[PDB]
Design a protein around this ligand. Structure first.
Ligand SMILES: [Zn+2]
Ligand SMILES: [Zn+2]
Length: 65
């Protein structure tokens, strides 16, 4: 019974390590994406909250009745 499939990786499918490309660990859905793939940076990763683009859209209302 499929409720939530546990596939979590950055949408480019290259790496996930701040050595090469900075990465945000989207706490809201345990999704490991890149900062420079979600329009974010590692400098404020130290400070501010960080998510994958789908969680932004999901917090926003959907066009339906
Ligand atoms: Zn990426
Ligand atoms: Zn997310």
């Amino acid at each position: 019974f499929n409720t939530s499939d546990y596939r979590f990786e950055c949408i480019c499918g290259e790496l996930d390590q701040i050595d090469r490309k900075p990465r945000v660990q989207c706490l809201k859905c345990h999704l490991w994406q890149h900062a420079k793939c979600v329009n974010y940076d590692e400098k404020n990763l130290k400070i501010k909250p960080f998510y994958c683009p789908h969680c932004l859209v999901a917090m926003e209302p959907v066009s339906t009745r």
